[PDB]
Amino acid sequence: RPIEEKLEVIPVFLITNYNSSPYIFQENEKQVCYMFLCPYDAENMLNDMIKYNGMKYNGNIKIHNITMKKAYELMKEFLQLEKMQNIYWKLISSKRQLQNALYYLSFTKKSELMYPVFYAENLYIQKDGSNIIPLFFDLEDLKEAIEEQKNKALSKVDYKIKVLNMVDLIFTEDHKKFGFVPSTQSVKYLDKLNIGTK
Structure with missing residues (x-):
């Protein structure tokens, strides 16, 4: 696609x-x-x-x-x-998500905060037909997907939440590894x- x-x-x-x-x-x-x-x-x-x-x-x-x-x-x-x-x-961008994203940016890194999307390090979803990394517009959706994962995990895993610029993702040399939520x-x-x- x-x-x-x-x-x-x-x-x-x-x-x-x-x-x-x-x-x-x-x-x-x-x-x-x-x-x-x-x-x-x-x-x-x-x-x-x-x-x-x-x-x-x-x-x-x-x-x-x-x-x-x-x-x-x-x-x-x-x-x-x-x-x-x-x-x-x-x-x-969502006014509320721009605020949510500031937390995850450093003082000088939040200067260029543009079109935030959120993702977690060790979180995946199965697309057709391989697995990709979910890219959430709403932080609360991400945290919700993490809790679903932790509630059924067999090990203790860290979910480092990171922020990306949706625009940069459009032009990645390979965005096939991402899915938008x-x-x-x-x-x-x-x-x-x-x-x-x-």
């Missing part, structure tokens, strides 16, 4: 009108749209829009879901048209968007 397919299972959230078109904001001096890896960060921005401009936004905004695949196609397609006005698609909350949230439609 290509990486474009590995990113497909990762939900991304935008705030849109009812036609599902994103709201553009002027970030001196480009046209910027916001894409959230965490749906509650998106809900927060929607809430701020209602709060500070209810006249313009009430009854006219919703959360819309795409995937990291589509999001990658967007960020990438941007750099191209840039050579040959254009919207800058800004990806926003989306935030279980992000995925669960997709049920709300589609169960809460007309």
Whole structure:
């Protein structure tokens, strides 16, 4: 499976009108749209829009879901048209996970903290058909997978939790050894968007 397919299972959230078109904001001096890896960060921005401009936004905004695949196609397609006005698609990591990740970075190592994903040293999962290392967007999902492993271990094992930059993983000379595990909350949230439609 290509990486474009590995990113497909990762939900991304935008705030849109009812036609599902994103709201553009002027970030001196480009046209910027916001894409959230965490749906509650998106809900927060929607809430701020209602709060500070209810006249313009009430009854006219919703959360819309795409995937990291589509999001990658967007960020990438941007750099191209840039050579040959254009919207800058800004990806926003989970606010809560960025905080969680700081713990695992040293003072000067946390400077470049970008798009955190978490993994454990001695933890694996079986993909098709070999075994790979699980890469979690949510720390709490990782810790949950560790406890499942320890509760059934035959030996005492250390699970050194480490943080990686999701971006660097896209371009590894060999990422076949990794599997992405989306935030279980992000995925669960997709049920709300589609169960809460007309």
